[PDB]
Design a binder for this molecule. Structure first.
Ligand SMILES: Nc1nc2c(ncn2[C@@H]2O[C@H](COP(=O)(O)OP(=O)(O)OP(=O)(O)O)[C@@H](O)[C@H]2O)c(=O)[nH]1
Ligand SMILES: Nc1nc2c(ncn2[C@@H]2O[C@H](COP(=O)(O)OP(=O)(O)OP(=O)(O)O)[C@@H](O)[C@H]2O)c(=O)[nH]1
Ligand SMILES: Nc1nc2c(ncn2[C@@H]2O[C@H](COP(=O)(O)OP(=O)(O)OP(O)(O)=S)[C@@H](O)[C@H]2O)c(=O)[nH]1
Ligand SMILES: Nc1nc2c(ncn2[C@@H]2O[C@H](COP(=O)(O)OP(=O)(O)OP(O)(O)=S)[C@@H](O)[C@H]2O)c(=O)[nH]1
Lengths: 429, 426, 117, 429, 426
């Protein structure tokens, strides 16, 4: 195997409710928990007639976790597993990590130690957080922190929603994201990344809708994610374990962050049009306008991709569609890497929301990868930071929250060697 | 006699299902049923692969080794999946990480003793043991690492009985994994020094041979596997049938390995014609040698035409003239004197069973020991260095208790192995 | 690797150890701690230990040292006492790190501490 | 086997009414006495329809025993067995032991000699008192006193409710508890202890309710106690006699005081949640937040535990769940006790009040034990005493009641060697 | 032939119910019913365990000794509980305190005479007496103390008839009591000097052997007991059946005890396969010796592989070849020459009944006298000292009229007993 999941921060919780929705939806388990091993690596058979959740929920304002215990699904989780700190969220790392966030952690852990025990030989914890938040950046920082020590012997794949390249929200965002990166870096196994803005494009350009509610982006990651755990931990013609990832996906200890991408994003109402070919979707994967991340392969050489397919797919179709790609060159893969294509084949096709806006094809490609591209994304996000730090901007908000000129300046230097790292492991031969 | 199959890893396992899917029908053994055998000859020699308990339950005597439950739990939850005695399933619910090191030193090393245990329960079954069949892929954990260990132990326990190895060497064009050359180079190393007969198959040499030699447009894995399993049946099981001139693992071994490395072969089936149409029946015999000896049709990736042969073993199995067989082989040896090495007056080892593949009239398995396979270990060995140089995904190995000298070792070894093989191409 | 660790351990402790599994007994782990702390009741530790019951005592001693010192690191005796390779490999690796940071300048006489056992 | 019981002091009587309730409740004997040997070791089959109790009730104010003869159960006991001294209670040892309490004792005894005769080869008297009271501390002091001489040849297990660590009631409490300890010490066999405050925690943390009426704590001990006598004196797969206890439970003549603990404390309303595993409850037993005693194993090494299980339990499950524990070393190490785990297995699962707040599982663990821990609890309670004695505080209240500077100072020295005793028998090898 | 069982204590008693539960069916005796025996052979020798009164009521000739009513009142209020003549129930309504001293010197010493009384009524039954079977646990009052007395008296009354003792020596990992080593060391003492055949069983050696050799997930006590009772049936009762080569308590005794201590054995059953599946029938014979002689499968705690054997008695009971029996035993004696002691050319005592366990085809009880059991009395003896040193729960003994020299005595004695046993391991 299983893989627990800790959805931290309002966002990580909204996305959580979403990814958690898509789940039962493709497993025939109504919001009442009941369906009429396989998928046991994400659901515990509490007896009994029910299913329950194999995860937890951590937010410092009740508002968001509250809504879960109102709307059907209310029945799905255990009243217990949804942790809250009535106190204050605070869009600031410090407070969430140190000062406040601290008080809850114990309790938090307890569940990921109480839920981690009940199972049978697990594989890790799929963590869901929103980089630039208070409860999402800070808190987790120490949650993943306390995990890397309590279970160093497992997988720590954290699924993040890192800062929109130009459309950020919080005024401080970078402070909170240069801080969640440096503290988690030395603790994660593989950090998946899905860019909030670069997903909108997909909603504008590849689905058409200027009315994208957060509830949609969530349905999307809620999809790409389903391709990761759900179906993969599910039997198939070319299974891929969680460990598999980090192994076939990270060339170096830095909790390396690949990018999530999905192939068939086409709007219902298009739903009837003749379906796309195994070749087209494959090709769509090499287009910088369909990757849930504003890290357009502006130069970033891929260094490993895990093409997770699902649905009706002939291994030759793949071991050909990929061959064609391996020789497009304009898709330049790293040097020190001969072949970096982990072909993951599942059976059961995707499963689109009954009536959202997702096409509903009979095959998809959730390809994720490490690309020297993020050399950018990190850069552009680091620079941000400086500008403000350069004037201390909202610094007094953290200091007064148990932090110091140290943690900032010393977490800046941190990422600095992440701009050099993602530079050295590539661009050079 | 006898032999005891070994399904190492998922692949080696997935294939188990196909090797046994076949073989059984080539021995009239229904799921749990007994011998429905259309004939009476598909029984006098079964022992080679089964055991007598009930009287209708001849259970395959193989081993299912894997650190990923889901797999064996797909093979055990499907068709023939319910024939293996549960005792056979040596699982490792651990994290079957894709690391050679994770299934050879850290994770697999534990599950080993609980395997050897059974490999002995099966060996000490009865009568006289011949050797063990080993299926797996050299591009993963449970395959290259843990399976490559299973043998290093087997070959210490019975350096007498033989060891055929069916390896799915990392296909060129596209690698179905990333560290591939890591998991590979490391397993070939173990092979060149334990098993004494290896049959290397390439998922893409198959596609080709399966999409152009079988107009088959959607070659699912099941197929590839199926084709492979077709060859390993012609090899073993087959020869454990009567014949004007029959051989058996050893003959095959003692006629095919000039030098102790162990050397790897490249299997090729005979009638490989598309269903309906093609059913040309041009199978008098010159048609089978026509087949078998062409470039395409060699389950290997490399092309024979790219390097002499040391030995060849046309293991035919269908009533034919020891004259039109013994003869053909000759012209073949003269039309291509160029590539067939000379210091062996008669490279070819003609073998001849009687009963053919259940539904066919005449077939002939080909087991070639050509120097061409040099151009594959080269490949592999290259991929290594190009990535070793930068220690690419090495932390996943070392961090699992490995050595920086371990990788060095293997490459070199297997790298030298390339060298030697050329010593005969010249 | 196992080879490297074993070489290190044998030199430090002046032990014979052929394989990592041998560490399962728990003696060596206690002595490693002794080199650092020098607080361990060495006479009590069953260095030679043949039987499992003896191993348990070593583990208890090890556990006590951790508690006394306030060492946070987890010790899953159930896993280690089995003498399984992976569990012991992991524990030994951590111990070496612990030793590297903690071990003081003072010289340590492993043989004498053992009573030449 | 039988075992008489003497509930002394209002409290010991409230708790009594409670423990006495749980009883019939799980024996099908309505408050009318009638049910439609086994359990005869606690109930005498008087007349040819009824089940007159097998105990007595001693309070110097009528108020509390009065309420028993109002509320159904009124029918349960014999009008006789509920002793009272219309006179005065007095929250002071002296008066209750010497002066007043004396007058009643004879009469009291008479019943425990009249009820002790009627039976068939008994085993002892389960005494119920509240350490820090007037009728509970003093009186009993001489009741148990007069027993140790009249039946030295039996078991004297006194079930006490010793002084809340910070939430005491009486102003003098310690005076009354350093005095009931020294006088009873040389007379009891095994003294069970249940801390009033440390039980509240359980009601706050393991059941959730800031509305715990005394009537609840009573339901609780009323439970842990049911696991002692009731069910144990009741057939099973691993019976454990009363003697058994003191033998397997006291290493030394000091009327040693083990602690009571229960495993499944979970609130109704939780009542549906998937039940807990044999391993979890077992483990819950080694948590210092579930033991009816503010003696958190702050260092106190256990020296003998009597794990009384009840319900559906496989001996291997135990002879494994315990094995796992024996190798946790939570306790820390004294040399001297190899194995100190008396596994008591009963059949009939627990029996929760129809609608109180107790979960109602199908298996529980009432583990009691002697822990070098009380080295604390006694300490902290002794110190109290001094502070006041150091100024004589409410001394004139006892002196004027037939006591002297002797009994105090000489009962202080007493416990002193109880602080050394509980220290020597442990902490050393 | 004859013998007279003895159910000392609760355990020894609880087991009585299982030993008789079995044995009866292995003799067609329904609750109070008679001989429904599927055959006619399960009757010509019954006498060994029953008595003729009515003509349909063959009553078990055992004794039920216990100071705790509830117990015998659970065994007498359940299934076969109503077959024992009430005269058999020698209860002691006293306080069956868990003290060896309370059931051997103070409380039990009284109830003794009222027992011996019956043990004589049963002995003087008829024909010729062979010996008495004794069940109990060395970790309690009515078991170790009072039962250990029952024998010290029996062995003074008929130092001729034998005395098999079935003791449930205190399991290691976790003890089902606290003073355990006290009640134990004290009873083993009495054993090493009265009974002349002891079969030590370990509640946890059983679990293991019952949770891994019988995929049984919920091994209730009833089970353990049941398994044990299975062995004690193979021993006695069995040999009181025909056979190509039959033996009887004495043979067993006169072939298994080289030196008068009395020595303790470790019983092992043959077909011990999980229900459905496993029903492999691999019971030709090499399969039974395979079983019996492995480490696991020895009801004892210790592992044979940890110390030579002095004697062994494969008491088989199912039609087999005195050749494939006599033979196997040999290889076994040579593959493991290492541990099997040498000064005994033929350690093994092959025994062979005919009729097998009612529903089975072939079984074989194993009674091993290995030096390995040294590593158990060691255990026990250790636990003692570690706690004796501090006189732990000693007041419960002395206060019952005991001696500080009594405990000394036993430990030493039983402690020396460890010593001696090593004198042969070398
Ligand atoms: N895809 C996606 N992004 C979201 C969602 N909710 C918020 N975000 C993004 O995540 C960031 C917002 O984090 P916040 O909601 O401010 O904070 P938090 O991380 O929940 O924790 P706190 O600051 O303490 O409240 C912004 O960059 C948002 O664009 C959501 O439901 N889906
Ligand atoms: N658990 C529990 N504790 C109680 C109960 N009633 C009282 N106590 C505790 O016992 C002590 C009170 O003793 P009192 O009621 O003052 O006195 P008494 O022991 O009945 O005797 P007198 O002083 O003569 O009235 C305090 O520590 C209370 O917290 C009860 O029903 N349950
Ligand atoms: N012919 C054939 N090749 C297979 C099959 N399954 C996998 N492979 C090939 O084998 C290699 C990886 O095999 P795989 O089955 O993943 O090994 P594994 O050890 O079980 O993998 P893991 O558990 O460590 S991730 C790839 O080169 C792939 O192309 C199969 O069923 N047939
Ligand atoms: N195999 C087996 N062991 C048992 C059984 N009953 C008890 N034991 C084991 O026997 C020992 C205690 O036996 P027990 O039956 O309590 O003796 P007793 O003399 O009757 O006990 P007491 O009356 O003095 S408390 C423990 O080690 C326990 O594990 C049983 O029915 N089968």
């Amino acid at each position: 195997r299983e893989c627990i999941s800790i959805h931290v921060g309002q966002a990580g919780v909204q996305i959580g409710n979403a990814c958690w929705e898509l789940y039962c939806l493709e497993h025939g388990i109504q919001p009442d928990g009941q369906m009429p091993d396989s998928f046991n690596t994400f659901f515990s058979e509490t007896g009994a007639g029910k299913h329950v959740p194999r995860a937890v929920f951590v937010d410092l304002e009740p508002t968001v976790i509250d809504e879960v215990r109102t709307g059907t699904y209310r029945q799905l989780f255990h009243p217990e597993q949804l942790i809250t700190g009535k106190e204050d969220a605070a869009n600031n790392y410090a407070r969430g990590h140190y000062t406040i966030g601290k008080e809850i952690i114990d309790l938090v852990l307890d569940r990921i130690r109480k839920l981690a025990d009940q199972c049978t030989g697990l594989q890790g914890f799929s963590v869901f957080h929103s980089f630039g938040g208070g409860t999402g950046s800070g808190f987790t920082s120490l949650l993943m922190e306390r995990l890397s020590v309590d279970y160093g012997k497992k997988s720590k794949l954290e699924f993040s929603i890192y800062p929109a390249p130009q459309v950020s929200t919080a005024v401080v965002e970078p402070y909170n994201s240069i801080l969640t990166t440096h503290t988690t870096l030395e603790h994660s196994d593989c950090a998946f990344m899905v860019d909030n803005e670069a997903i909108y494009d997909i909603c504008r350009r590849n689905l058409d809708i200027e009315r994208p509610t957060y509830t949609n982006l969530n349905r999307l990651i809620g999809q790409i994610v389903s391709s990761i755990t759900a179906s993969l931990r599910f039997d198939g013609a070319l299974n891929v374990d969680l460990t598999e990832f980090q192994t076939n996906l990270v060339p170096y200890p830095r909790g390396h962050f690949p990018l999530a991408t999905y192939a068939p994003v086409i709007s219902a109402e298009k739903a009837y049009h003749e379906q796309l070919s195994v070749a087209e979707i494959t090709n769509a994967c090499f287009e910088p306008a369909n990757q849930m991340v504003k890290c357009d392969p502006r130069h970033g050489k891929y260094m490993a991709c895990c093409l997770l397919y699902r649905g009706d797919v002939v291994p030759k179709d793949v071991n050909a569609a990929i061959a064609t790609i391996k020789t497009k060159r304009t898709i330049q893969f790293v040097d020190w890497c001969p072949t970096g294509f982990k072909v993951g084949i599942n059976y059961e096709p995707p499963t689109v929301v009954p009536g959202g806006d997702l096409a509903k094809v009979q095959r998809a490609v959730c390809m994720l990868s490490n690309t020297t591209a993020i050399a950018e994304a990190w850069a552009r996000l680091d620079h941000k930071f400086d500008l403000m730090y350069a004037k201390r901007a909202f610094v007094h908000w953290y200091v007064g929250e148990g932090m110091e000129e140290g943690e900032f300046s010393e977490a800046r230097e941190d990422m600095a060697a992440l701009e050099k790292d993602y530079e050295e492991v590539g661009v050079d031969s | 006699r006898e032999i005891v199959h070994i399904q190492a890893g998922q692949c080696g396992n997935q294939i188990g299902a196909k090797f046994w899917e076949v073989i059984s029908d080539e021995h009239g053994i229904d799921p749990t049923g007994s011998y429905h055998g259309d004939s009476d000859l598909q029984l006098e020699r079964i022992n080679v692969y089964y055991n007598e308990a009930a009287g209708n339950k001849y259970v395959p005597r193989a081993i299912l080794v894997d650190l990923e439950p889901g797999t064996m739990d797909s093979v055990r939850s499907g068709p023939f999946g319910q024939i293996f005695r549960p005792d056979n399933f040596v699982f490792g619910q651990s994290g079957a990480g894709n690391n050679w090191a994770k299934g050879h030193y850290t994770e697999g090393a534990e599950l080993v003793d609980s395997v050897l245990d059974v490999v002995r329960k099966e060996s000490e079954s009865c009568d006289c043991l011949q050797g063990f069949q080993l299926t797996h892929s050299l591009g993963g954990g449970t395959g290259s690492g843990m399976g490559t260990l299973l043998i290093s132990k087997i070959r210490e326990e019975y350096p007498d009985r033989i060891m055929n190895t069916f390896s799915v060497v990392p296909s060129p064009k596209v690698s179905d994994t990333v560290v591939e050359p890591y998991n590979a180079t490391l397993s070939v190393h173990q092979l060149v020094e334990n098993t004494d007969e290896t049959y290397c198959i390439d998922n893409e040499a198959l596609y080709d041979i399966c999409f152009r030699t079988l107009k088959l447009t959607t070659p699912t894995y099941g197929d590839l596997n199926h084709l492979v399993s077709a060859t390993m049946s012609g090899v073993t099981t087959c020869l454990r049938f009567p014949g004007q001139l029959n051989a058996d693992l050893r003959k095959l071994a003692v006629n095919m390995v000039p030098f102790p490395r162990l050397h790897f072969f490249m299997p090729g089936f005979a009638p490989l014609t598309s269903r309906g149409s093609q059913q040309y029946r041009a199978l008098t015999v010159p048609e089978l040698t026509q087949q078998m000896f062409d470039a395409k049709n060699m389950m290997a990736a490399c092309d024979p035409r790219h390097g002499r042969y040391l030995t060849v073993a046309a293991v035919f199995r269908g009533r034919m003239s020891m004259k039109e067989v013994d003869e053909q082989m000759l012209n073949v040896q003269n039309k291509n004197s160029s590539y067939f090495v000379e210091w062996i007056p008669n490279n070819v080892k003609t073998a001849v069973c009687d009963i053919p593949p259940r539904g066919l009239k005449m077939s002939a398995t080909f087991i070639g020991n050509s120097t061409a396979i040099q151009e594959l270990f080269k490949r592999i060995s290259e991929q290594f260095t190009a990535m070793f140089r930068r220690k690419a995904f090495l932390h996943w190995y070392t961090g699992e208790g490995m050595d920086e000298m371990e990788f060095t070792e293997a490459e070199s070894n297997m790298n030298d192995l390339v060298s030697e093989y050329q010593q005969y191409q010249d | 690797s196992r080879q490297e660790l074993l070489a290190w351990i044998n030199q430090v402790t002046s032990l014979g150890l052929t394989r990592i599994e041998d560490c399962g007994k728990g003696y060596a782990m206690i002595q490693i701690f002794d080199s650092i702390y020098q607080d361990i009741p060495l006479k009590k530790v069953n260095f030679e230990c043949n039987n499992e019951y003896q191993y348990i005592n070593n583990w208890k001693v090890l556990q006590q040292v951790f508690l006394k010192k306030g060492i946070d690191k987890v010790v899953d005796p159930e896993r280690l006492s089995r003498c399984k390779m992976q569990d012991n490999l992991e524990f030994v690796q951590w111990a070496k790190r612990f030793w590297d940071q903690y071990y003081p300048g003072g010289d340590y006489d492993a043989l004498a501490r053992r009573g030449n056992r």
